[PDB]
């Protein structure tokens, strides 16, 4: 009942920039291997034991934020359903430690090597300690994203990532078919050690606030060339196919010359030789067998993309000027293939965009084909293993290869134009990336409400390290993290990406910043004005206005605020040290403005928008959703009914709604070893509890999911499906096979109403109401479901001491959606008995005030720690690998909510 | 939109050359008809110079320019369409930049009036004001990216020295033609000269700006003295001489609205340095503008003639103040306003200098001097009052704000504690207090409804007034 307090260490996670995954058509290898060597570990630098865990994590959901989190904090590898870790004695997943047997069991110590293997086909994650097997495996986990190696640690640790080759040297041989993780570094990037989802770093002058990162997806590696299968080619295109093919052969031969290959009987890169280059006819057929389809694909794509192709001059199509290589240049053969003259051909800029586009497609087709052949990506080239350093879709490709590919293609296009086949490019079309979720795109930082000012003349500065989307200004204390800054009446801000002022909408103002530009935000509460300066110059509207905003109402007050978009870095100086202010003297001093923190001993405390979704009570004044507490009758039980306030109206909000009840039911610590009147003895000695959900007529059951959620459900998915539920299987066996145990862990346990709707797609709308019942035995860990009094096949088994909240996920199609019915069946107790100790023996259903409907809210304010763990990352050497060190302790006082198991 | 290098290439260059060279030829012709036409001709010429991609004043280096017909076209072309075969001969009458700049400097040092060099003021100088910047961008002193800077030689040779010399010569011309009754060309010369003031060097302040504003301030003082005398003696004669002083105010305000718009830009580009490293010349200029603004606030005739000048001459003033954003292109009250007035705007812009003069402690003395000026005491009166109340200087020990403010005062290099003296403090407080008090009056005059024009009573009795 009462809130609990204890002191906990801060824990940080460090990963290499290796990202591996599995997708259909992906160019990416499944099996991977890495090692971690421990150099120095302090077991108890503080009262709380030192934290060290090694394993894998998933990009989309592994967001361990400093300080508070699930349970008692210290979130790291295995404290979520997105991470899988090993501490020496346990395997960690879902914030649960499961003992695992190894020879010489002991918590990770110095001179210990942990070998982590990931096989994405099964999928499975396996460990070895000092060359000895770990008798436990993670398997059957979700593959919705990319996997990266990760170590979570508190202070008192020195460790070394060993990734193979140069970037570490393995102490134990990788198992067969498992690639070193150093082979996964992408062409455009270099190997490094980085934090995960950081909203803060250090810099020269001070801390830099960091926006959300833009991250890759397992689908990005899948090449997606445009379809060209269902088309028809004109006879002139079919005939030009072969000539264009042989021509690109000879151009390949020419380029290969200029690199320096001469005539060879064998093709190899070391051999310094090129066979095909004798004559543009003498080229071996197999090269033609590969590249005739390539040549045809060029034209087929020209058709698919909408380019208009005709004949301009049959005379040039027949006769062509031929550029002959200089006779000064020599060839073993004595004949050098002479290509068409490029000089008599000029290409418009639109042709260049077409070249970029067709290069995209050609590379993707080649990639995708090699993939079907079985090829994969690898920073290191091995042809026998079918590993290539280029087998990645064009976008991720390196600028050098990319450039070679444009040049080859543009010469080919100029060759076609010399043939005289006229090509007219179509108009360009716009597209939207949709890389991130709207909530995850923008982070807002503000000062704490304690610092709210209702009077005076205040100054503060914001340096823009990037030139992208960032907004700086003044916000009201009740600013919502969810809304974009300035869209509402709660913020007056300047956006220098476009030169805009935002308050209840956007208006042009001032000019965009450049990199390093400093925006000075000034507020006068005596004249009720807001002023912005850029490097000492007062920004003006499209008028003589020196004020961005006027006639401001003081109200509650104002606070400094900033918003950073993805890939953005800012530096907010509130003037604690006046000497650090670069333009205050130029503007603000003589005007009288004072720094926001002129005489503050400690730095201003900040809060940031945390995109971790959490369950919050449904607001009574919510415009769209209404919750009604219905008193129980003799015929009906107590109920909590949901209604759509704004249904059937423009401005209505129709989107997925994730709801739970405020209180959990907790399973027993120890599970037991194996008319319509309740029997007293049975109902008083039973451990079975019941609730139900009534889906009203007009609400599509296919849009409804019913069941339970653990207190670690943070998945806010508009495109929700039971396939998206996090799941994992922990399997423990003897040294050889002999599986002793196999446990399935999931945060969500539910049933789909589409599984209970009888097949009635005809007249799909049903006048009837669907009553799904949920039953739990708190002594066996068994969960079952009923459709309309008919037992469903779905069943779940959960471990003891588990907490579960009644939960409903629904997409409204009606103004009356669902009804939590807190009742009972015959000889089954209601949820009140389980939730409340005083009612443990009272079958009478009842819904006290504490029980209430909570709705998932994607974003929430979170306090930024005053100090942050200092982590040293380096490359010790080629053999030693990459070194991570944390030596200085940090502690936080944690407030723990028991029913929610968070801090 | 920087389209010239793509538009005016082959025959458009020929047409623009012909237009340019004819318009320049006009200089020789002296006639009544030309006089009225030279403004528009010079404006068109200026816009042509800004757009025209070749450097016709620097032909010897045209070989390096690619947006030139002579480079683009073969010599076998340029013969079919009769061309001189040399860029210099395209129209030789127009002199080179060196010769033209030298002639301008010679006229300025000679003291030539508008009548001797009218072609220049109305046609030539606007063309240079559009030529020099565009070619300073492409010449040395330009921001060089590595490869663009190292590869083709710059066609032009324009540097900031050219622009500074031109600005100084223009200022010299204005001062030479300062008192004349008819100087309609000044408004246009200012708008054309504004762009080149950004490159202006610091020395220009002492060399040109201080004497100009000093002479103009002295003239204003004399005219207000005559006004005071004419009020001292109040007869039907007082109607006479008032016309004279209003004429003096009109010509004076014309000179001011010519000179100030350039100064505003110079201040906006040197205020940061003048505030970081204090500048005595900047402080003196602040004193000058403060005296002029004080005369403006005190004199009824001065203000009304300023308004009349502005409204008849269609001076924007909002263009002068907001030109930076505009240049970068990224009702009677609307036509004229007190806040839009250059007299107030320049003073507001340079006020930070005067407040930097004042140390934070002197704020109490400033407030007292403001009260005394509201009592309408004289400058010497406020000086002796602050001399006798000097002990009352503010103390840091009482408030923490003064501590860091005074720390910054130390941080200023020029400032030394031992330099501060009672006479300096009293003078400084006098100046700043007078300026701030008169500025308060200007900001919130309450002059509104002094002559109500709602005319609600007349809308009521509309039939009765008729």
From Swiss-Prot, chain A:
Protein name per Swiss-Prot or TrEMBL: Ryanodine receptor 1
Note: Binding of [3H]ryanodine indicates that the heterozygous channel is activated by Ca(2+) concentrations 4-fold lower than normal. Single-cell analysis of cotransfected cells shows a significantly increased resting cytoplasmic Ca(2+) level and a significantly reduced luminal Ca(2+) level.
Residue ranges of Sequence repeats: 212-325, 326-439
Chain spans, region Interaction with FKBP1A: 40-51
Free-text note on domains in this protein's UniProt record: The calcium release channel activity resides in the C-terminal region while the remaining part of the protein constitutes the 'foot' structure spanning the junctional gap between the sarcoplasmic reticulum (SR) and the T-tubule. Pore opening is mediated via the cytoplasmic calcium-binding domains that mediate a small rotation of the channel-forming transmembrane regions that then leads to channel opening.
GN (gene name): RYR1
Localization, UniProt: Sarcoplasmic reticulum membrane
Modifications after synthesis and translation: The N-terminus is blocked.
Effect of residue 446 to W: Decreases protein stability
Tissue spec. comment: Detected in skeletal muscle (at protein level). Fast- or slow-twitch skeletal muscle.
All copies of domain B30.2/SPRY, residue ranges: 1-168, 384-579, 675-827
Protein role: Cytosolic calcium-activated calcium channel that mediates the release of Ca(2+) from the sarcoplasmic reticulum into the cytosol and thereby plays a key role in triggering muscle contraction following depolarization of T-tubules. Repeated very high-level exercise increases the open probability of the channel and leads to Ca(2+) leaking into the cytoplasm. Can also mediate the release of Ca(2+) from intracellular stores in neurons, and may thereby promote prolonged Ca(2+) signaling in the brain. Required for normal embryonic development of muscle fibers and skeletal muscle.
Family membership noted in the UniProt record: Belongs to the ryanodine receptor (TC 1.A.3.1) family. RYR1 subfamily.
Subunit field text: Homotetramer. Can also form heterotetramers with RYR2. Identified in a complex composed of RYR1, PDE4D, PKA, FKBP1A and protein phosphatase 1 (PP1). Repeated very high-level exercise decreases interaction with PDE4D and protein phosphatase 1 (PP1). Interacts with CALM; CALM with bound calcium inhibits the RYR1 channel activity. Interacts with S100A1. Interacts with FKBP1A; this stabilizes the closed conformation of the channel. Interacts with CACNA1S; interaction with CACNA1S is important for activation of the RYR1 channel. Interacts with CACNB1.
Curated annotation (Swiss-Prot), chain B:
Similarity section: Belongs to the ryanodine receptor (TC 1.A.3.1) family. RYR1 subfamily.
Domain of life: Eukaryota
Organism in which the protein naturally occurs: Oryctolagus cuniculus (Rabbit)
Miscellaneous: Binding of [3H]ryanodine indicates that the heterozygous channel is activated by Ca(2+) concentrations 4-fold lower than normal. Single-cell analysis of cotransfected cells shows a significantly increased resting cytoplasmic Ca(2+) level and a significantly reduced luminal Ca(2+) level.
Self-association state and partner proteins as the record states: Homotetramer. Can also form heterotetramers with RYR2. Identified in a complex composed of RYR1, PDE4D, PKA, FKBP1A and protein phosphatase 1 (PP1). Repeated very high-level exercise decreases interaction with PDE4D and protein phosphatase 1 (PP1). Interacts with CALM; CALM with bound calcium inhibits the RYR1 channel activity. Interacts with S100A1. Interacts with FKBP1A; this stabilizes the closed conformation of the channel. Interacts with CACNA1S; interaction with CACNA1S is important for activation of the RYR1 channel. Interacts with CACNB1.
PTM remark: The N-terminus is blocked. Channel activity is modulated by phosphorylation.
Protein name: Ryanodine receptor 1
Annotated signal sequence range: none
